[PDB]
Design a protein around this ligand. Structure first.
Ligand SMILES: OC[C@H]1O[C@H](O[C@H]2[C@H](O)[C@@H](O)[C@@H](O[C@H]3[C@H](O)[C@@H](O)[C@@H](O[C@H]4[C@H](O)[C@@H](O)[C@@H](O[C@H]5[C@H](O)[C@@H](O)[C@@H](O)O[C@@H]5CO)O[C@@H]4CO)O[C@@H]3CO)O[C@@H]2CO)[C@H](O)[C@@H](O)[C@@H]1O
Ligand SMILES: OC[C@H]1O[C@H](O[C@H]2[C@H](O)[C@@H](O)[C@@H](O[C@H]3[C@H](O)[C@@H](O)[C@@H](O)O[C@@H]3CO)O[C@@H]2CO)[C@H](O)[C@@H](O)[C@@H]1O
Ligand SMILES: OC[C@H]1O[C@H](O[C@H]2[C@H](O)[C@@H](O)[C@@H](O)O[C@@H]2CO)[C@H](O)[C@@H](O)[C@@H]1O
Length: 1526
């Protein structure tokens, strides 16, 4: 049905970790195939990759993967396959990788670099676990019970083995591991295989004989089987080692070990004649070792020629020097240092006059000097005559060359004999282990480092045996040339083995690779899996090829590994590439009771009440996504992986720790009897079995065998004593786990708590889905440490039930049968007396232990949490979509956002945000305020966060989420959204307190995703199908557009109104500024589809026209303020943006709007009937601006005084505007009025800045006239199409200028008046005074302003005209100027409001500073350095247009040669929005800020989410979509 996992990829192609589960491996869940389906009838899993839109890997991007395309295709490690990434700047691309058979699969990416070269990412691996079933029942990988048995101790007949089989079948083990059943070598140890392709002839003969026995175990006792596979060595007496002696490391294949061979045979030649002339054979004296090492420091070390293996033969170089005296003379260079610098001189001869392999160990005299090149230097340095002190000089050089070799020799020798007298002690003289057997044909003084034989080729060989080191890195092959192990004698050799030499591939050892393959695929035909001993010592490429060969034979191969790498990462990397399915963990390794508790905690599961993952605000919500209406698209028999909620966002694939196979005792560690006692066998195996993983045990652990059986020597047979030891308990433990394996699935479905009080260890196991669980109390018997009483066990909101209890007791010692390995007699005594109290008020359960609970005892309780039933996951993950059905884009504002001051408007000052103790308040009262805090908590599973603490300390926040919506209950769909929350929050409170936090975030997160999806559904298609970064900016519309009670856009009705920004510009009069509204009107409402809401805003300000202007501070129409020379032209520009985008937008012009003002600019006749008298259509309103602007406007700030502005003096009150018709631009403003977007009013009394405007923009602002040209260009085409009835503007005096002529006057004079030429030659045409100038290639900021140097200032204001009126700009002048702004005025997220070179560059805004610095005090520096995000929008808007026309690399066109940009241009756009993507991504407030200090430093005062800061970035995405994505 639906077995699809989502694997999100980063901008660099790396997988995204959805949760922090630690250093892990991308593993896919072990689930059975669907009902009646075999391998091949359908895909096992579908990995859906997600590549971001516009990422650097989209540029000519491909997806490589070794996943075979279909089931008919086999697997090859290097046979990758191409997949095309569908590039887009809006829509992310999904690519499926259907998997048909388990194994190891990797993927990498190829893309086009910024250097236009090819580049590749890492190989990223993911593993699909095999499907284990015995008769037909699926065996979950974490319900496996493995019983390891040694072959040579089970009787010499097949039926003798089937007696041992029936014994472990009663103990209810489901899997058996075998030591390899092959013909064993000389030592008969099970790991020195005589012939890998021949099974042990004592028992079986044919291959069907062993295959029929393993299938018998499957059909008789329901037991799967697996075997050890030996890669690293073979027996030291194989009849094929004589034919192919090159399969191992010999003097030919690895010549560096020759120095170690002549030393090993210097001891087999010494340990048989040592005492003959020496003295001590086997004495237990310190002096005996000294004289033995004195016999060593005189007959082996000193008898090997001072080791010429390092030192250059001094006198044999001078002899070979003079022998020719360099007939080939060839040095005239001066690269030789002076003879004084004897250090570099020695290195110089070493770097030039040496045969290849200098320093590299090989033959006896393999480090020699190139004579013809050495005598050439000697003739150059000293003399061309030999008798001129060459014998002294040449020897002086070589002696200094061998000084680092003489000291490398002393460091080697000191380690050879120090390792010797340290092991021969432990080998013989009982330090802690004795057996002092003297000289022998099997036990000399030194163990055999090399196996000697005479091969069939005739020559003699000396293959080495493998072993181990101490703390040495196991990845380093000690048998390779990189290690000096066999020489320095640091090898714990295993004589029965012979280190097998694999190369870089089958090319280095052909017969070894061919024989091991046929040996691996022979066992793969029979068994269900393998066990790899010392896998960390097997090289990766060796195991990768052989495990793939096995999986091609057995597709469901189950691999267990003994993996000990230095880091968890290397262990993960080994599991990633090799395809390992289980990592062995040993319980006997814990030295104390505390270490076993920590080992148990590691593989036990996740904490109780652990957080669950939910797609929050970090996911794209496509409006065209499938859904399960009531979590009903999951039939059980389909075995489909479930999505998180009703929204079918598939289950994310994240790196999880590799699965573990916990062994209470392996076949190599000592017996509980040896390390601890025989009593601890019961609690140890009880804590092991309770873990959430696979378990295993060696045979003899349950039967309480005496001591660890030596796998080399012993020949005794297992005893047939049935039901001994723990056999009765393991039958209860394994059968219990069989019931749990039915419903325990994912990592979030198995929770656990462990406690350690002395010799007791507590294990609480819990299934998070149903509430079921077990409680285990195990008293550990490491040492008999006296009577200890455990306190009262108190369970919260739970009920307990006694299951069983036991105690293992020793009834003396074990028999000493020399024919059968019998165990220790043990009594299994069932216990009682466990008092289970249950308070029926607090629902608390108390458990008390009886005084008779000795060490080596356990007791098991079956628990069940109250409140949690099986139908709880279904109730919470359903109904949220239907609840959000009636939501509107306005109503979703109250569900998710609402700042605290906005909430106070509806609650009259009684509610606000739920103050989380020891933290603060969420940013929004809605769900978003929780989600921003909850996401990083769920990611880190932080149950210690103050939010998690408060959630389990009470139910205050649980009811606060539901009780807020009483303020907004009457709005569209909120009542049904609140009702869903109320019913789910009610069900949550009936749960244990520690489980409220995990379920609280889940209920909030699911209702959040269905609300955010409801937003993409109501909005348009360009938004709903885009990337998270686009949808994140789109939600700002819902944020800003909110109905209030203290304000609105209409004076008669409190309807929806757009805020300038949260939280400061959201309440009362300071909410909707006309300038801020209409700059954002195209980005927040038009780009998203809020046409009706955008029309209401246009009609609302149309009633407030006065002085031929649109008011800045809109007082909902109830007496506003008209200090806005900028508002009217951003307002009329939004009219053009409305008609251009909205289908049928021309209807706006003929929309009557009740003119609440006498057109003759009067005072404030508010309720006077003249307000409700006449109206003016938008058409009239538009022309009213133009005609009155240049024609007739003359006003002082109406109804002024401190009531209006307190600081702005009377000089700023009387302000005006006039168009110089000899240029056509809109001049106006005073040096006392800040009627532009840079509206700053001084207020520092301590600097005499009171009333002084911070940035007065009198004259012709680039933005004002730029929007005027766009207005004129629009109104012309309006009449050409047949609407706008006006064509001539009335001149002030009484004349009549034409509109197209006014449109032409700007076109003929605008760029002439503003542009500053880069060349001083053309300063005579563009009206420039070169004395007051800053940078050339600059478009002006103001024309004939008050202070003429504010004219020639680099500011981001010109780019508004570059976007609304591109016809005023010649391409090369505009592109050359916008590149300067990108190099100077562009911050990371905000646009610098002033050139950093200009003296007035104060880029640190501080409105609390009340000092004497004119700018910094009281925030006068507002627009003199600080970086604003909205100007960045218009900047990159024109950066797209002009760099498209100008530079040709940004062009490639395509279909119908429609001009479409290139990947290089999209790469220049994407790279300038990632600092913006970061901001909203990692900001609590979901949005971009109003301000930003120098280089993105968070301005403390800046409103964190601003309207026109985000709408200006949404404007860019509409251009790239409406002009190319067709
Ligand atoms: O509602 C009726 C109202 O009547 C009178 O109103 C006028 C004010 O007295 C008058 O000063 C002016 O308001 C000015 C404002 O004083 C001025 O400083 C400037 O606005 C700037 C700030 O200068 C600037 O520091 C910054 O302030 C933000 C801050 O950055 C932000 O982090 C957060 O702290 O919020 C602060 C604002 O609260 O930005 C603002 C952006 O405007 O210009 C304003 C005019 O545009 O005009 C008022 C006109 O009614 C009474 O005086 C007033 O008390 C009554 O409330
Ligand atoms: O109650 C309103 C207002 O009354 C007072 O303000 C007035 C001044 O007292 C009065 O002198 C005058 O001040 C202005 C000058 O007439 C004008 O020529 C120019 O110099 O600007 C002066 C300041 O505006 O008129 C104002 C009108 O408000 C009183 O001081 C205020 O506190 C009080 O709010
Ligand atoms: O102060 C001179 C210094 O700053 C300049 O910028 C302004 C200056 O701040 C004004 O006082 C006046 O001199 O006009 C200058 C140009 O607009 C320049 O940025 C700088 O090169 C100059 O040395």
């Amino acid at each position: 049905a639906h077995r699809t996992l989502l694997l999100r990829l980063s901008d660099s192609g790396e997988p995204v970790t959805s949760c922090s589960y630690g250093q892990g491996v991308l593993t896919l869940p072990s689930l059975p195939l669907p009902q009646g389906k075999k391998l091949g009838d359908m895909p096992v899993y579908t990995v859906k990759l997600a590549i971001p839109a516009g990422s650097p890997v989209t540029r000519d991007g491909l997806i490589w993967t070794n996943c075979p395309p279909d089931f008919s295709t086999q697997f090859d490690r290097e046979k990758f396959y191409k997949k095309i990434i569908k590039t887009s700047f809006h829509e992310d691309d999904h690519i499926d990788l259907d998997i048909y058979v388990p194994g190891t699969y990797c993927f990498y990416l190829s893309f086009k670099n910024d250097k236009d070269e090819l580049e590749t990412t890492r190989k990223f691996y993911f593993v699909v676990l095999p499907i284990l079933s015995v008769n037909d029942k699926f065996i979950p990988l974490n319900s496996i019970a493995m019983q390891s048995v040694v072959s040579k101790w089970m009787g010499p007949t097949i039926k003798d083995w089937e007696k041992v089989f029936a014994r472990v079948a009663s103990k209810k083990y489901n899997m058996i591991h075998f030591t390899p059943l092959q013909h064993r070598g000389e030592s008969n140890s099970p790991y020195s295989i005589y012939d890998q392709l021949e099974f042990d002839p004592t028992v079986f003969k044919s291959e069907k004989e062993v295959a029929d026995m393993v299938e018998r175990l499957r059909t008789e006792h329901n037991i799967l089987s697996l075997t050890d596979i030996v890669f690293n060595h073979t027996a030291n007496n194989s009849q094929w080692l004589l034919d192919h002696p090159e399969a191992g490391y010999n003097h030919k294949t690895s010549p560096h070990l020759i120095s170690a061979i002549e030393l090993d045979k210097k001891l087999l030649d010494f340990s048989e004649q040592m005492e003959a002339l020496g003295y001590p054979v086997d004495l237990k004296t310190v002096d005996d070792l000294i004289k033995v090492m004195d016999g060593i420091k005189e007959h082996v070390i000193g008898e090997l020629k001072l080791w010429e293996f390092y030192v250059v033969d001094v006198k044999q170089t001078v002899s070979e020097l003079r022998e020719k005296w360099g007939n080939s003379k060839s040095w005239s260079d001066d690269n030789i240092p002076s003879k004084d610098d004897s250090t570099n001189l020695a290195q110089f001869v070493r770097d030039n006059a040496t045969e290849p392999g200098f320093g590299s160990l090989g033959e006896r005299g393999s480090n020699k000097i190139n004579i013809d090149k050495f005598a050439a230097i000697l003739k150059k340095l000293h003399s061309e005559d030999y008798n001129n002190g060459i014998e002294e000089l040449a020897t002086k050089i070589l002696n200094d060359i061998n000084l680092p070799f003489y000291k490398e020799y002393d460091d080697d020798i000191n380690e050879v004999l120090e390792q010797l007298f340290n092991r021969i002690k432990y080998l013989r003289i009982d330090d802690h282990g004795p057996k002092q057997g003297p000289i022998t044909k099997k036990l000399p003084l030194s163990e055999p480092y090399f196996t000697r034989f005479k091969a069939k080729d005739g020559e003699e060989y000396a293959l080495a045996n493998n072993g181990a080191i101490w703390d040495g890195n196991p990845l380093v092959d000690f048998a390779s040339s990189q290690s000096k192990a066999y020489l320095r004698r640091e090898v714990i050799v295993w004589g029965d083995c012979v280190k097998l030499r694999y190369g870089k591939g089958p090319s280095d050892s052909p017969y070894l690779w061919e024989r091991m393959s046929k040996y691996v695929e022979m066992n793969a035909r029979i068994f269900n899996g393998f066990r790899i001993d010392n896998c960390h010592s097997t090289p990766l490429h060796v195991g990768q090829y052989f495990l793939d060969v096995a999986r091609r034979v057995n597709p469901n191969l189950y691999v267990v590994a003994q993996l000990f790498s230095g880091s968890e990462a290397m262990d993960c990397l080994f599991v990633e590439r090799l395809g390992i399915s289980s990592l062995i963990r040993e319980a006997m390794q814990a030295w104390s009771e505390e270490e076993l508790s920590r080992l148990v905690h590691r593989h036990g599961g996740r904490p109780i009440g652990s957080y669950k993952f939910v797609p929050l605000d970090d996911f794209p919500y496509p409006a065209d996504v499938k859904i399960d209406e009531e979590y009903c698209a999951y039939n059980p028999d389909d075995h489909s992986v479930k999505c998180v909620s009703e929204i079918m966002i598939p289950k994310t694939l994240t790196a999880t720790p590799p699965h573990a196979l916990f062994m209470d005792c392996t076949h190599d560690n000592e017996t509980p009897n040896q390390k601890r006692t025989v009593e601890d066998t019961l609690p140890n195996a009880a804590l092991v079995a309770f873990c959430s993983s696979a378990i295993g045990s060696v045979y003899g652990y349950d039967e309480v065998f005496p001591q660890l059986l030596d796998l080399v020597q012993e020949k005794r047979t297992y005893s047939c004593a049935e039901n001994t030891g723990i056999s009765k308990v393991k039958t209860l433990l394994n059968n219990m786990r069989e019931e749990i394996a039915s419903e325990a699935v994912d990592i979030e479905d198995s929770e656990m708590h462990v406690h350690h009080d002395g010799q007791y260890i507590t294990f609480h196991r819990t299934n998070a889905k149903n509430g079921k669980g077990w409680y285990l109390v195990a008293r550990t018997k490491f040492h008999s440490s006296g009577d200890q009483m455990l306190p009262r066990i108190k369970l919260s909101q739970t009920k307990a039930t006694f299951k069983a209890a036991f105690s293992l007791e020793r009834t003396g010692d074990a028999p000493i049968s020399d024919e059968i390995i019998e165990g220790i007699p043990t009594k299994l005594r069932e216990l009682t007396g466990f008092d289970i109290g249950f308070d029926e008020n607090t629902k608390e359960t108390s458990i008390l232990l009886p005084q008779d609970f000795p060490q080596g005892s356990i007791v098991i309780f079956e628990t069940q949490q109250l409140g949690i039933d099986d139908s709880l996951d279904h109730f919470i993950r359903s109904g949220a979509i239907k609840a959000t059905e009636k939501l509107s884009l306005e109503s979703i504002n109250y569900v998710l956002y609402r700042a605290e001051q906005e909430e106070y408007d509806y609650s009259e000052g009684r509610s606000g945000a739920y103050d989380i103790p020891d933290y603060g308040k969420p940013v929004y009262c809605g769900l978003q305020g929780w989600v921003s805090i909850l996401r990083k908590i769920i990611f880190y599973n932080d149950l210690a966060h103050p939010l998690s603490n408060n959630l389990r300390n009470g139910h205050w926040a649980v009811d606060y989420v539901v009780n807020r919506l009483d303020l907004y209950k009457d709005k569209e769909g909120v009542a049904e959204v609140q009702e869903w929350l109320r019913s789910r929050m009610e069900r949550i409170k009936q749960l244990p307190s520690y489980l409220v936090p995990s379920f609280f975030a889940l209920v909030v997160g699911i209702m959040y995703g269905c609300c955010r999806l409801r937003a993409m559904q109501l909005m348009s298609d360009n938004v709903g199908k885009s990337t998270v970064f686009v949808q994140s900016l789109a939600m700002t519309s819902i944020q800003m557009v909110s109905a209030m009670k203290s304000t609105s856009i209409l004076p008669d009705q409190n309807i929806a109104a757009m805020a300038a920004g949260l939280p400061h510009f959201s309440t009362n009069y300071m909410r909707c500024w006309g300038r801020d509204v209409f700059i954002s009107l195209r980005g927040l409402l038009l780009t998203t589809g809020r046409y009706e809401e955008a029309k209401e805003h246009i009609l609302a300000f149309a009633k407030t026209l006065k002085h031929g202007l649109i008011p800045n501070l809109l007082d909902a129409g109830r007496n506003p303020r008209y200090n806005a020379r900028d508002a009217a032209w951003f307002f009329v520009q939004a009219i053009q943006d409305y008609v251009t985008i909205v289908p049928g937008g021309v209807s706006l012009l003929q929309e009557k709007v009740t003119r609440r003002f006498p057109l003759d600019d009067e005072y404030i006749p508010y309720d006077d009937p003249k307000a409700f008298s006449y109206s003016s259509t938008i058409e009239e309103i538009i022309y009213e601006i133009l005609n009155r602007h240049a024609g007739g406007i003359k006003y002082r700030e109406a109804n002024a005084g401190p009531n209006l502005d307190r600081v702005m003096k009377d000089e700023g009150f009387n302000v005006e505007v006039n168009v110089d018709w000899e240029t056509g631009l809109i001049h106006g403003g005073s040096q006392f009025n800040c009627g532009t977007w840079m509206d700053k009013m001084g207020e520092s009394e301590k600097a005499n800045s009171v009333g002084v405007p911070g940035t007065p923009r009198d004259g012709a602002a680039v933005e004002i006239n730029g929007l005027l040209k766009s207005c004129l260009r629009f109104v012309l085409q309006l009449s050409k199409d047949g609407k706008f009835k006006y064509t001539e503007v009335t001149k002030p005096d009484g004349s009549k200028i034409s509109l197209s002529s006014w449109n032409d006057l700007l076109q003929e004079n605008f760029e002439r008046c503003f542009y500053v030429p880069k060349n001083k030659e053309d300063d005579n045409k563009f009206e420039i005074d070169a004395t007051i100038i800053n940078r050339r290639g600059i478009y002006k900021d103001l024309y004939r302003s008050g202070k003429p140097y504010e004219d020639y200032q680099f500011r981001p204001n010109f780019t508004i005209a570059m976007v609304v009126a591109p016809e005023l700009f010649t391409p090369d002048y505009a592109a050359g100027a916008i590149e300067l702004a990108d190099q100077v005025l562009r911050g990371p997220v905000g646009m610098r409001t002033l050139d950093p070179s200009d003296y007035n560059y104060r880029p640190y805004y501080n409105n609390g500073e009340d000092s004497d610095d004119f700018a910094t005090s009281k925030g006068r520096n507002y627009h003199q350095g600080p970086e604003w995000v909205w100007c960045y929008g218009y900047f990159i808007r024109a950066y797209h247009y002009f760099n498209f026309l100008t530079n040709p690399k940004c062009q490639v066109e395509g279909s119908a040669k429609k001009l479409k940009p290139s990947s290089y241009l999209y790469r220049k756009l994407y790279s300038r929005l990632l600092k913006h993507r970061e901001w909203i991504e990692n900001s609590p407030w979901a949005g971009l800020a109003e301000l930003t200090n120098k280089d993105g430093e968070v301005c403390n005062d800046s409103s964190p989410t601003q309207a026109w800061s985000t709408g200006c970035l949404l404007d860019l995405f509409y251009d790239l979509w409406i002009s190319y994505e067709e």
